[PDB]
Amino acid sequence: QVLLLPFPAAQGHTNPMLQFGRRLAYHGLRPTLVTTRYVLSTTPPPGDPFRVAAISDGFDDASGMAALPDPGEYLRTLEAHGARTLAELLLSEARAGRPARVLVYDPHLPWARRVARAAGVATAAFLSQPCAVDLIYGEVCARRLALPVTPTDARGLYARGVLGVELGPDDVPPFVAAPELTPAFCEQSIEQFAGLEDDDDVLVNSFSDLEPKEAAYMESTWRAKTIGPSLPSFYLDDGRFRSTVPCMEWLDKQPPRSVVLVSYGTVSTFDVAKLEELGNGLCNSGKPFLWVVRSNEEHKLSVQLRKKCEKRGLIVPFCPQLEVLAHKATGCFLSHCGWNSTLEAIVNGVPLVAMPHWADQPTISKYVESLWGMGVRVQLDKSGILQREEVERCIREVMDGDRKEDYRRNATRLMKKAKESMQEGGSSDKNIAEFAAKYS
Ligand SMILES: O=c1ccn([C@@H]2O[C@H](COP(=O)(O)OP(=O)(O)O[C@H]3O[C@H](CO)[C@@H](O)[C@H](O)[C@H]3F)[C@@H](O)[C@H]2O)c(=O)[nH]1
Ligand SMILES: CC1=C[C@H]2O[C@@H]3CC[C@](C)([C@@]2(C)CC1)[C@]31CO1
């Protein structure tokens, strides 16, 4: 048995780990998704070839995140209850005749390691953020960089050939460049790396052609092996689809490369004025657009703005984002540049307009714009606000610019390297097959 333990609830942690698990099953391993009782009760299971098992974060009936909006407080409770119930699960599983061969875990759950190790179970950390950000956190954890991290430290990393781009103040990861803003997330980001060297394996959802210096450093410093992009094999053109979702039918009616997909992710919240600038920007661009506005956010949307969006947009609460990104009508993606989103754009060859909020997004956005060349980043005004004119300018810059073809050329180029990495003999595929063999 292979246990897979993502950060619970966090869809940006769970899909990639599930896809890695399908490849393990292809090689003969048996994967089990481990998740909270709440999420189990309130979500269909993944299905074959996965078993499911449960632990508790304390809130088996309510959402604990909702209950404990203070993040330090939630993490503390997840740790107390998760660690206890994971220990219980490792024993109950052995007693049922399914002893865990390895626990693959998100090291945003640092406690998972100690519990597995004390139960005698091999451990494999699964990093779901890019090498470039991972390694900076790593440098802090290893006491080679002090907090706060500065553009000067970043420039040393670039000068040493470790980072492939020079990060300015808006590009350094804010959790360690401005730790005061987010104390719990700083500590969580850094503590990923505490004890990592005791792991049997360390894995990262990226591919080495995308971040070659950063992946090489992560490997020689932390034994990190690239196993991504961890996406369904169909999108990767890997031989060894079409849904009925209504928004796909709308998209079927649009001309080729005409549509802007717009999504700011599952976590971040936008206030009314910010939604107003984003949505007016979209309407003002004159492009068709599929704008994802979550159920828990849509009450911030005025009737007027909503009516303006009807002329050539469609607003939905959720879309099948991979399917949309693979669709012929889709011309670019205005994205917060979460890592999962960015990798999905890359595998589909879709150029990006980046509008980062935090975590790894500012750094990712800088790579998009400078090293990868597959898009542009929105420039906030002097006081930190995104204006509708900037949203509109960037959409039009990517879709009608003199550099329209540069963004497309790079996105296509990187699409092909991403597919190669995950096909048989590719750099990521090889690390997957090695891991598979190790535990079979
Ligand atoms: O309508 C929808 C909306 C989303 N999805 C899918 O949900 C996932 C969103 O992941 P992404 O990394 O872009 O956003 P999120 O989990 O906020 O990322 C956090 O977690 C990431 C991983 O640690 C991190 O890089 C990032 O900074 C964090 F914000 C991605 O697989 C989408 O395809 C969808 O299918 N339909
Ligand atoms: C609330 C939360 C959400 C997740 O998604 C976001 C990306 C990393 C992150 C620290 C975490 C894994 C963990 C904390 C998060 C808050 O930043």
Side-chain angles (χ1 to χ4, degrees), residues 105 113 141 191-199 222-223:
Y105 73 97
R113 175 168 50 253
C141 179
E191 292 286 306
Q192 283 185 111
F193 288 88
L196 205 64
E197 66 275 352
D198 303 332
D199 280 340
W222 296 106
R223 307 161 295 128

Side-chain angles (χ1 to χ4, degrees), residues 232-253:
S233 66
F234 170 78
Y235 293 106
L236 293 162
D237 293 340
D238 181 5
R240 77 254 223 255
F241 189 168
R242 185 186 171 86
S243 74
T244 51
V245 181
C247 68
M248 299 301 306
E249 178 182 4
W250 184 88
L251 219 51
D252 294 332
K253 288 182 189 106

